Design a protein around this nucleic acid. Structure first.
Ligand code: MG
Ligand code: MG
Ligand code: MG
Ligand code: MG
Ligand code: MG
Ligand code: MG
Ligand code: MG
Ligand code: MG
Ligand code: MG
Ligand code: MG
Ligand code: MG
Ligand code: MG
Ligand code: MG
Ligand code: MG
Ligand code: MG
Ligand code: MG
Ligand code: MG
Ligand code: MG
Ligand code: MG
Ligand code: MG
Ligand code: MG
Ligand code: MG
Lengths: 56, 53, 154, 43, 204, 121
RNA sequence: UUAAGAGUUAAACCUAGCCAACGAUCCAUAAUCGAUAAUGAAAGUUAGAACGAUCACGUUGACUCUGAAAUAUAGUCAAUA
RNA sequence: CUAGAGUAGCGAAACGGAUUCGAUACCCGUGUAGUUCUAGUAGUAAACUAUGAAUACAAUUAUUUAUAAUAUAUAUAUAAAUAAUAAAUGAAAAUGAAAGUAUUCCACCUGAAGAGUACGUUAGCAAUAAUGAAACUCAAAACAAUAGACGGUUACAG
């Protein structure tokens, strides 16, 4: 049946985050944190990767 | 005994009630989202100390 | 709803056994008509609209916003160390509804057992439902109106 | 779903069509018994 | 007149021109002193084969038509059986349409992820260009690019709260001083309370 | 107990009076032939030598019948008439023979209750 | 075919139905009923001898004629005596 | 119970030692099956609260138990459970928020014995499980409580 299959496939997609998070929002939020910190690079990449792994 | 047992809710009262209920739902969702982003930020601070490599 | 009326009858008996002066019943048209018939017949001291918390001091208008929290508050009468409303029972039960014509109602009021219903007693009130109006059995006989024999109260 | 059929038949049929079930699957008595698990090869 | 009964079609399409109609009648059971419903199933003739299972139909007495058929459908009182077949047929196409549509949407979203941050923000902030500015263009500005959805939600929420609170305050004020409410009732054209609330709610 | 259970057949058991003389086939009495005359011992506390006889009735059933009265002249192949009524202290004997009917004579020198013992005035 | 409907009976073609745990099918038992009789406070229960109503049969089975109406207490054939 | 593994302890049966008038028993020793695991069959227990499920209602107290407060203190409110009860019910024992007041639906009962037996049927590899008679006999049979008697029954005194 198409509905069950599409729902399960969307669950199995990469970069899918649990606890009601979205990857687009998460990336924009992290960039906003860094820009705000400036207004007041590999280490930030590692922080991002740790977050995405914990929220995967 | 003459009074009607129930008086129907007028369309204006219904509209105001729907406004308030939609607001309640939206506010709860927004507060969940705000605390969610806050917890994400508090993890983003301590993410320095997490080994990934 | 005969189930709710049966619940009210049993609740009235329970409240008379412990001698509470004021109690509440569900707020419905049938419940209000039944309580009004009891009040006019002298079985209740007072009948008020109110909430789940108590009778209303001033008029409170009933709407869908507060319909679930409405109650009807009834005052019970006692005299000479005896409750005025001792027994209150259904005749027409939910699983056996008894609809009588006017002639059988007269027979019942005259001492004849009709459909296993014991006849009317000297100080008893039998209520009848006709066209969604509760009313005294003798009144239904006077108006020549067939109906559902609903409950006894003594 | 039986309530939905009694209430809104159009939405009922659309719903059971979209969920992968037919009307028989809804209206018929279904004890999820050993015979079902054999006929439909659940395991 | 002829015997007439009202019943539910409980079995159709299994016999040619014959349906099964379930009828109920009021009887008195003296053994239990109760008015009961006595149920029966009739084989009923259906010329035109118009009835379906679940229809409420009136059956009428006729001449004997077979060994067991003595009644015919005289009228379709309620036609839920035909409606069920209509919706059965319609849902087949209705569902499949959006089933294909949303599968297309899923595949497009997958491709968008396939052809797919902090580096872009670093380039935009530091260069403020070495052939990278237009390359970014193909994908005051640092902020608007970093625009979360929660902010719009908060703006809409404050708008909603303000609307509700203002409506209630205005309503209470008008109901308090009852001269200006009359002024407004003749300006805009116990029922007066509902009409006043209508006018105040359209007011904002 | 519920109304639907009473509709389905629940109710007081019938006060059905079972026949105490099934071998007569709802007849006031039956003719029979005595197969033998027996002398049985009653149950305790009663003590006596009770006069009885096996009798085959015209309907074929063989029963044990008490012989009432002080003295009897029943003997094998005698024709007797058998009515209901058990002998309480003899288990298995559920019938009485009629004195003064058939080949069984009425009680000799009976004064009281003559009709119960086949005696003429 | 019938005055006349109907798998009622006969013939042909189809469809795959129909009844049934609220009791089918099968088996046993029984003529049925009342403003009739019995009983009981009554609901009811019992009987169905008498009075009346209806059915079925006239030693057993099938068929036929006549007839508006008969498998007739008729006729034919068979069985029993 | 059927297969396949496992089997240290326990332990039907069996074999012995005691005890006894006798031992076929209690006790002691070896100890098979079983108890264990895997895949099944079977669907019975005092499978018990000897108390079917749901709903509405009825006077108290004390404990906890879990939330919600308010500033350890409010001997804090609102729920559930437990314990002792009022009323009510009940043959009583007693139940006590049900064994009360009511309503709805289902299951079941109609003296003891024969008998949960026989026969039949269905299911199961079997053991069996389910369904479930009648004749015969009797004026019995049972429950709660009462007062004794008795106990290889307790404690206290003299
Ligand atoms: Mg036809
Ligand atoms: Mg004598
Ligand atoms: Mg034809
Ligand atoms: Mg044919
Ligand atoms: Mg049968
Ligand atoms: Mg006969
Ligand atoms: Mg009869
Ligand atoms: Mg007669
Ligand atoms: Mg005669
Ligand atoms: Mg004849
Ligand atoms: Mg003769
Ligand atoms: Mg003949
Ligand atoms: Mg093995
Ligand atoms: Mg072992
Ligand atoms: Mg051992
Ligand atoms: Mg012993
Ligand atoms: Mg041993
Ligand atoms: Mg199993
Ligand atoms: Mg057993
Ligand atoms: Mg059992
Ligand atoms: Mg009891
Ligand atoms: Mg057995």
């Amino acid at each position: 049946t198409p509905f069950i299959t599409r729902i399960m496939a969307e669950l199995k997609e990469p970069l899918v985050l649990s606890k009601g998070y979205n990857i687009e929002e998460v990336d924009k939020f992290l960039a906003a944190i860094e820009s705000a910190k400036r207004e007041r690079i590999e280490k930030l990449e590692d922080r991002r990767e740790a977050i995405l792994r914990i929220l995967s | 005994m003459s009074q009607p047992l129930l008086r129907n809710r007028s369309p204006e009262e219904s509209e105001l009630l729907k406004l308030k209920r939609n607001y309640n739902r939206s506010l709860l969702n927004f507060q969940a989202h705000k605390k969610k982003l806050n917890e994400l930020l508090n993890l983003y601070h301590v993410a320095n100390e997490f080994i990934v490599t | 709803s005969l189930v709710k009326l049966a619940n009210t009858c049993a609740h009235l008996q329970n409240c008379s056994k412990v001698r509470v002066a004021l109690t509440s019943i569900p707020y419905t048209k049938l419940q209000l008509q039944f309580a009004y018939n009891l009040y006019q017949q002298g079985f209740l001291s007072s009948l008020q609209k109110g909430s789940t918390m108590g009778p209303d001091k001033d008029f409170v208008e009933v709407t869908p916003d507060n319909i679930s929290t409405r109650r009807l508050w009834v005052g019970l009468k006692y005299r000479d160390n005896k409750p005025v409303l001792s027994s209150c029972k259904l005749i027409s039960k939910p699983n056996s509804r008894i609809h009588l014509p006017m002639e059988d109602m007269k027979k019942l009021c005259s001492g004849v057992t009709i459909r296993n219903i014991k006849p009317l007693q000297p100080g008893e009130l039998i209520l009848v439902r006709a066209h969604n109006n509760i009313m005294d059995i003798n009144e239904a006989i006077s108006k020549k109106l067939d109906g559902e024999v609903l409950c006894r109260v003594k | 779903l039986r309530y939905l059929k009694r209430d809104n038949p159009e939405k009922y049929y659309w719903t059971i069509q979209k969920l992968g079930l037919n009307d028989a699957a809804i209206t018929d008595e279904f004890n999820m018994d050993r015979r079902y698990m054999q006929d439909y090869e659940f395991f | 007149a002829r015997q007439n009964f009202l019943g539910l079609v409980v079995s159709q399409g299994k016999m040619q021109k014959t349906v099964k109609v379930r009828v109920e009648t009021k009887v008195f059971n003296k053994k239990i002193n109760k008015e009961l419903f006595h149920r029966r199933d009739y084989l009923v003739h259906d010329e035109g084969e118009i009835s379906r299972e679940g229809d409420l139909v009136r059956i009428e007495a006729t001449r004997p038509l077979s060994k067991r058929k003595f009644f015919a459908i005289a009228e379709i009182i309620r036609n839920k059986g035909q409606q069920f077949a209509l919706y059965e047929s319609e849902a087949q196409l209705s569902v499949a349409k959006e089933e294909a549509q949303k599968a297309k949407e899923f595949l497009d979203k997958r491709s968008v992820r396939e052809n797919k941050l902090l580096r872009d923000i670093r380039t935009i902030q530091d260069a403020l260009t070495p052939k990278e500015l237009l390359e970014i263009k193909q994908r005051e500005t640092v902020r608007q690019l970093l625009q979360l959805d929660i902010s719009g939600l908060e703006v809409n929420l404050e708008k909603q709260r303000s609307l509700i609170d203002r409506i209630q305050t205005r309503l209470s004020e008008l109901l308090s001083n009852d001269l200006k409410c009359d002024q407004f009732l003749k300006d805009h054209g116990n029922i007066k309370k509902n009409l006043l609330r209508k006018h105040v709610m359209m007011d904002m | 107990a519920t109304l639907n259970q009473i509709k389905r057949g629940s109710g007081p058991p019938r006060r059905k009076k079972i026949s105490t003389a099934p071998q007569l086939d709802q007849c006031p009495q039956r003719k029979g032939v005595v197969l033998r005359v027996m002398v049985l011992k009653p149950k305790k506390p009663n003590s006596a030598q009770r006069k009885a006889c096996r009798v085959r009735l015209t309907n074929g059933n063989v029963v044990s019948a008490y012989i009432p009265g002080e003295g009897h002249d029943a003997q094998e192949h005698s024709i007797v008439y058998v009515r209901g009524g058990r002998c309480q202290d003899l288990p298995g004997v559920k019938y009485h023979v009629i004195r003064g009917a058939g080949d069984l004579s009425g009680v000799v020198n009976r004064i009281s209750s003559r009709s119960k013992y086949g005696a003429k005035k």
